[PDB]
């Protein structure tokens, strides 16, 4: 069954710290404990070590990422921007 209506993973915090703080924590906790797709082996086996470290349990490859998600929007934008700059300067 569904055990909690809305607190989800933040049920461990009980009634403490405030609902809005528990929500802000819930979003990033789900992000940080999710399993992500390995961009090298194609499996859904990438999990976080410490903040910013994302290791695939298969193929043993670890990539630097965001503190709570494998890729921040800033870093994806920076990746696309640097790709564009490289391609423009080289051609």
């Amino acid at each position: 069954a569904k055990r909690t209506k809305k607190v989800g993973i933040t049920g461990k915090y009980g009634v403490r710290y405030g609902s809005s703080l528990r929500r802000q924590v819930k979003k990033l906790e789900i992000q940080q404990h999710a399993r992500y797709d390995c961009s090298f082996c194609g499996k859904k086996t990438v999990k976080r070590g410490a903040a910013g470290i994302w290791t695939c349990s298969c193929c043993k490859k670890t990539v630097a990422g965001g503190a709570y998600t494998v890729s921040t929007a800033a870093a994806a934008t920076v990746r696309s921007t640097i790709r564009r700059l490289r391609e423009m300067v080289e051609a």
């Binding site: 710290y17 802000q24 924590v25 910013g52 670890t62 990539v63 630097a64 965001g66 800033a74 921007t81």
Partner: protein, 202 residues
């Protein structure tokens, strides 16, 4: 430990002696193990490569930027931070860059930076939620926590101490020319109060 951004141990060959040289870089986002990092004037514009600031086009995002050529990294080292190349001055060779704080700086065009953004970004977006988590954060940085308010002390302990109510008593904005023991509060504050309006003055 004590750092938000992860480090990358990058092994180069020693160009003058047969051996390996391990280096401790701050990992940029997207850098992975087994990746070939290229460092030098002629390295390609790829995330994780180390380039001189002059060799990158305007708008490039770099990290661990040298303030002076060869100081091995001073700027945009914290998690999620980066420097933006906003232009070059080829004569009197220099690069104008935007620092994380919003400041514009002119650096030698020979100073190096790492392509990309420091990994670990978004870290401060999670509420600590707990004195215990603040405790464990500063346990690996320094003894600066917890902080007793000076207004909760006695006059002997702090400028803000004393009084039959807790209150500063005098303006908390302290002159830049004040001396040690006086510089508690808002040192050399240009202004106070809730920031309303836009930043980046001209």
């Amino acid at each position: 430990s004590g750092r938000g951004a992860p480090l990358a141990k990058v092994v180069f060959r020693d160009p003058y002696k047969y051996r390996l040289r391990e280096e401790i870089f701050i990992a940029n986002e997207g850098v992975h193990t087994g990746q070939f990092i290229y460092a030098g004037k002629k390295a390609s514009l790829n995330v994780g490569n180390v380039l001189p600031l002059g060799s990158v086009p305007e708008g490039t995002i770099v990290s661990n930027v040298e303030e002076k050529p060869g100081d091995r990294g001073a700027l945009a080292r914290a998690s999620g931070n980066y420097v933006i190349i906003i232009g070059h001055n080829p004569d009197e060779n220099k690069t104008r860059v935007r620092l994380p704080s919003g400041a514009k700086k002119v650096i030698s065009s020979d100073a190096r930076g790492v392509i990309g953004v420091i990994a670990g970004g978004g870290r401060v977006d999670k509420p600590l939620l707990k004195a215990g988590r603040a405790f464990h954060k500063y346990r690996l940085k320094r003894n600066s926590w917890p902080k007793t308010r000076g207004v909760a002390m006695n006059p002997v302990d702090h400028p803000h101490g004393g009084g039959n109510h807790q209150h500063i008593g005098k303006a908390s904005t302290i002159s830049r020319g004040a001396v040690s023991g006086q510089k508690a509060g808002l040192i050399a504050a240009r202004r106070t109060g809730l920031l309303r309006g836009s930043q980046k003055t001209q």
